[PDB]
Scaffold this active site. Structure first.
Site, PDB file in Angstrom:
ATOM      1  CB  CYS A  31      -0.905  -0.041   1.236  1.00 19.18           C
ATOM      2  SG  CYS A  31      -1.572  -1.695   1.615  1.00 19.18           S
ATOM      3  CG  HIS A 201      -3.825   0.037  -0.599  1.00 11.95           C
ATOM      4  ND1 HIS A 201      -2.636  -0.650  -0.746  1.00 11.95           N
ATOM      5  CD2 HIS A 201      -4.072   0.620  -1.798  1.00 11.95           C
ATOM      6  CE1 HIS A 201      -2.205  -0.470  -1.978  1.00 11.95           C
ATOM      7  NE2 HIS A 201      -3.049   0.287  -2.630  1.00 11.95           N
ATOM      8  CG  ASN A 221      -5.664   1.591  -6.712  1.00  8.28           C
ATOM      9  OD1 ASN A 221      -4.829   1.503  -5.758  1.00  8.28           O
ATOM     10  ND2 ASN A 221      -6.749   0.782  -6.846  1.00  8.28           N
TER      11      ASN A 221
END
Lengths: 256, 163
Positions: A31, A201, A221
């Site tokens: 993460c 995360h 992401n």
């Protein structure tokens, strides 16, 4: 002080490729790590005004921190990762099996809540080891390829101080409360309604905007291009939606 | 709002190791034993390279053995980093030498697979248990060997040897 309503780092810093870029951690709970090597790259390209632009190594960060950055592939935290960066430097490291940088990434890609040509992710996992040498042939050595930051810090829970940090210095990183309706996010401004929480995360914020009126944070992401809107997703800007504003960190790179 | 705020304020000072702002914040009463998401305390942060902040934090009663999302205590991190001086101070303020984690990781396990005689030795002189079991099925000795440090691989076996 003044700030546009639709600012986009990839836009104001067109000369900085790593910004547009989206990555894949493939069965690691990296993460923090990817969200961090990610800001410290656009930021290095920005601070030197694009005189230097490099893909900072997820791999390196991931495996060479130690208990000070968490548990490798089982979670970690930005504060120490970013100040780890200011305290010990990170090297070059493009995507998996790519022969770019002193330490390219060593976890193969996978698929995150998506159906597609690649293998289905293995659910968090196994920390790779930490070799402090590069890929055979990569010319400048590990000690020579290290990139150090000048200082590391948090921004406050206000949006203005986060929106302003991106404006003057570059895309920043953060964490947020995860929900299952979030997996499956495709387009538009996400907002939680029907989901179970599943973790917190880290990610990379690089602008904001208003869409159709609903305000929002432009994010990258670490689940790859077929996930989300090409890797990317807007989220609710203003209420600390899902804690997305509670933990924001960024550092300035070392001039020279 | 000073709870979470002062707490964060100290967390940033300890992390930035800003001794004087450490000195103030705690004297006025920042929690010292504060905890952010994850489970990190200042003493975890200060167990990096700041000895006065590690001293003062313990002297205002910081849990010397707090654990996080992971399971590490400041003594863990210190072992990893090195900092013989901090770890001597951690042990003396009651650090558990076998503070374990979700992996079964002790300060001895981390210290030989990150290469540091000095510290593993103090852990040893201080009741570090040699035989223990990291679930991956790896004692400090495997780890010692496993990674790249044969020196330490030796000292660990002779002690267990008399075992």
């Amino acid at each position: 002080l003044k700030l546009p309503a639709s600012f986009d780092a990839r836009e104001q810093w067109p000369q900085c490729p790593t910004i547009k870029e989206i990555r894949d951690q493939g069965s690691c709970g990296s993460c923090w790590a990817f969200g961090a090597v990610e800001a410290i790259s656009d930021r290095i390209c920005i601070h030197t005004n694009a005189h230097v632009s490099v893909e900072v190594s997820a791999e390196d960060l991931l495996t060479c921190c130690g208990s000070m950055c968490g548990d490798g592939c089982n979670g970690g935290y930005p504060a120490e990762a970013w100040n780890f960066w200011t305290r010990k430097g990170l090297v070059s490291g493009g995507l998996y099996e790519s022969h770019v940088g002193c330490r390219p990434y060593s976890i193969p890609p996978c698929e995150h809540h998506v159906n597609g040509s690649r293998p289905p992710c293995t659910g968090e996992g196994d920390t790779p080891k930490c070799s402090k040498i590069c890929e055979p042939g990569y010319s400048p050595t590990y000690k020579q390829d290290k990139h150090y930051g000048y200082n590391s810090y948090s921004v406050s829970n206000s949006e203005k101080d986060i929106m302003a940090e991106i404006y003057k210095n570059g895309p920043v990183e953060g964490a947020f409360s995860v929900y299952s309706d979030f997996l499956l996010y495709k387009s538009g401004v996400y907002q939680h309604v029907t989901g179970e929480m599943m973790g917190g995360h880290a990610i990379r914020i690089l602008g904001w905007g208003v869409e159709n009126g609903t305000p929002y944070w432009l994010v990258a992401n670490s689940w790859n291009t077929d996930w989300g809107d090409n890797g990317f997703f807007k989220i609710l800007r203003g209420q600390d939606h899902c804690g997305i504003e509670s933990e924001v960190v960024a550092g300035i790179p070392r001039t020279d | 709002h000073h709870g979470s705020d002062l707490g964060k304020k100290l967390l940033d000072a300890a992390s930035a190791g800003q001794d004087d702002e450490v000195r103030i914040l705690i004297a006025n009463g920042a929690d010292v034993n504060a905890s952010d998401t994850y489970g990190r305390t200042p003493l975890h942060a200060a167990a990096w390279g700041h000895l006065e902040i590690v001293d003062v934090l313990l002297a205002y009663g910081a849990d010397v053995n707090a654990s996080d999302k992971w399971g590490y205590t400041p003594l863990h991190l210190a072992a990893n980093e090195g900092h013989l001086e901090i770890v001597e101070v951690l042990l003396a303020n009651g650090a558990d030498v076998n503070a374990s984690s979700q992996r079964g990781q002790t300060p001895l396990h981390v210290a030989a697979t990150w290469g540091h005689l000095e510290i593993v030795d103090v852990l040893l002189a201080n009741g570090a248990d040699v035989n223990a079991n990291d679930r991956q099925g790896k004692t400090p000795f495997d780890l010692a060997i496993d990674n790249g440090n044969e020196d330490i691989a030796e000292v660990l076996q002779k002690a267990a040897k008399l075992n």
